[PDB]
CSV table of C-alpha atoms in Angstrom, one decimal:
chain,number,residue,atom,x,y,z
A,21,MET,CA,11.4,28.4,23.9
A,22,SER,CA,12.7,25.6,26.1
A,23,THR,CA,9.8,23.1,26.5
A,24,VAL,CA,8.8,20.4,24.0
A,25,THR,CA,5.1,19.5,23.2
A,26,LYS,CA,3.6,16.0,24.0
A,27,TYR,CA,0.8,14.5,22.0
A,28,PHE,CA,-1.3,11.6,23.5
A,29,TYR,CA,-3.0,9.0,21.3
A,30,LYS,CA,-5.7,6.8,22.9
A,31,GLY,CA,-5.1,3.4,21.3
A,32,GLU,CA,-7.6,0.4,21.2
A,33,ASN,CA,-6.6,-0.7,24.7
A,34,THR,CA,-3.4,1.1,25.7
A,35,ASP,CA,-2.4,4.7,25.2
A,36,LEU,CA,0.4,5.6,22.8
A,37,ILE,CA,2.2,9.1,23.4
A,38,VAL,CA,4.5,10.8,20.9
A,39,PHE,CA,7.0,13.6,21.4
A,40,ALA,CA,7.0,16.9,19.4
A,41,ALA,CA,9.0,20.2,19.2
A,42,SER,CA,6.3,22.8,19.6
A,43,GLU,CA,2.6,23.4,18.6
A,44,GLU,CA,3.8,25.8,15.8
A,45,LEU,CA,6.1,23.5,13.7
A,46,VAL,CA,3.3,20.9,14.4
A,47,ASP,CA,0.3,22.9,13.1
A,48,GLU,CA,2.5,23.8,10.1
A,49,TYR,CA,3.1,20.1,9.1
A,50,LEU,CA,-0.7,19.6,9.1
A,51,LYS,CA,-1.0,22.8,7.0
A,52,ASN,CA,1.4,21.1,4.6
A,53,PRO,CA,2.3,17.4,5.1
A,54,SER,CA,5.9,16.7,4.2
A,55,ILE,CA,7.7,13.4,5.3
A,56,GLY,CA,10.9,15.4,4.5
A,57,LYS,CA,10.0,17.7,7.3
A,58,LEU,CA,8.4,15.2,9.8
A,59,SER,CA,11.9,15.2,11.1
A,60,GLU,CA,12.2,18.9,12.3
A,61,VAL,CA,8.8,18.2,13.8
A,62,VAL,CA,9.4,15.0,15.8
A,63,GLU,CA,12.8,14.8,17.3
A,64,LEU,CA,12.5,11.2,18.7
A,65,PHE,CA,11.3,8.5,16.4
A,66,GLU,CA,9.8,6.1,19.0
A,67,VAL,CA,6.4,5.5,20.6
A,68,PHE,CA,6.3,5.6,24.4
A,69,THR,CA,3.5,4.5,26.8
A,70,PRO,CA,2.5,5.2,30.4
A,71,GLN,CA,4.2,3.1,33.2
A,72,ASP,CA,3.3,-0.4,34.3
A,73,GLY,CA,0.2,1.1,36.1
A,74,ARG,CA,-1.6,4.5,36.6
A,75,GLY,CA,0.8,7.5,36.6
A,76,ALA,CA,2.5,9.4,33.7
A,77,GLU,CA,5.1,10.7,36.0
A,78,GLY,CA,6.5,7.1,36.3
A,79,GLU,CA,9.0,5.9,33.6
A,80,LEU,CA,7.3,5.8,30.2
A,81,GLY,CA,8.0,2.5,28.4
A,82,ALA,CA,8.3,1.4,24.8
A,83,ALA,CA,5.5,-0.3,22.7
A,84,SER,CA,6.3,-3.7,21.1
A,85,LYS,CA,5.7,-4.0,17.4
A,86,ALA,CA,2.8,-6.4,18.2
A,87,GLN,CA,1.4,-3.5,20.2
A,88,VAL,CA,1.8,-1.0,17.3
A,89,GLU,CA,-0.1,-3.3,15.0
A,90,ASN,CA,-3.1,-3.0,17.4
A,91,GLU,CA,-3.6,0.4,15.7
A,92,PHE,CA,-1.8,0.6,12.3
A,93,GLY,CA,1.2,-1.7,12.0
A,94,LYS,CA,-0.2,-4.7,10.0
A,95,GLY,CA,2.3,-3.8,7.3
A,96,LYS,CA,3.1,-0.1,7.8
A,97,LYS,CA,6.5,1.2,9.3
A,98,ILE,CA,7.3,3.6,12.0
A,99,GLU,CA,7.0,6.8,10.0
A,100,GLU,CA,3.5,6.5,8.7
A,101,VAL,CA,2.3,5.3,12.1
A,102,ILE,CA,3.6,8.5,13.8
A,103,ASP,CA,1.9,10.2,10.8
A,104,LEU,CA,-1.7,9.2,11.5
A,105,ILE,CA,-1.2,9.9,15.2
A,106,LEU,CA,0.3,13.4,14.6
A,107,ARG,CA,-2.9,13.9,12.5
A,108,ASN,CA,-4.9,14.8,15.6
A,109,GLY,CA,-4.3,12.6,18.7
A,110,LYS,CA,-5.6,14.2,22.0
A,111,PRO,CA,-3.9,17.4,23.2
A,112,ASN,CA,-3.4,18.1,26.9
A,113,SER,CA,-4.8,21.0,28.9
A,114,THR,CA,-2.0,21.3,31.4
A,115,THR,CA,0.1,19.2,33.9
A,116,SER,CA,-1.1,20.8,37.2
A,117,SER,CA,0.1,19.2,40.4
A,118,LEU,CA,0.9,21.3,43.4
A,119,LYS,CA,-1.0,24.3,42.1
A,120,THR,CA,-4.7,24.7,42.7
A,121,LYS,CA,-8.0,25.8,41.1
A,122,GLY,CA,-9.2,29.5,40.4
A,123,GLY,CA,-10.4,31.5,37.4
A,124,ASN,CA,-14.2,30.8,37.0
A,125,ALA,CA,-16.7,33.3,38.3
A,126,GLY,CA,-14.8,35.8,40.4
A,127,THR,CA,-13.7,35.0,43.9
A,128,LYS,CA,-15.1,37.9,45.8
A,129,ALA,CA,-16.8,40.0,43.1
A,130,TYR,CA,-19.9,38.4,41.5
A,131,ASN,CA,-20.9,34.8,42.2
């Protein structure tokens, strides 16, 4: 209870990411859609994208409306858009970095 969940959404050319509270409140929304609840689920109403290059640790940026239309903005708004994405974007395994590998077929038992 102290970390938010992040949901990625591979767009047509760029990648749009969205913020979320936790996997629980999320799975729930899907188990029962409710625009009146989408709030408790998403805390920030804005789409952010990687940095001007490769690297998510950089400074996420904002997507211009023209960029949102590349997916579903022809005439939609900002709520519905975040809705289709929340549907099932692309979860992330983990944000490793200085850690290492391990956990596969024993390290000294059976290989």
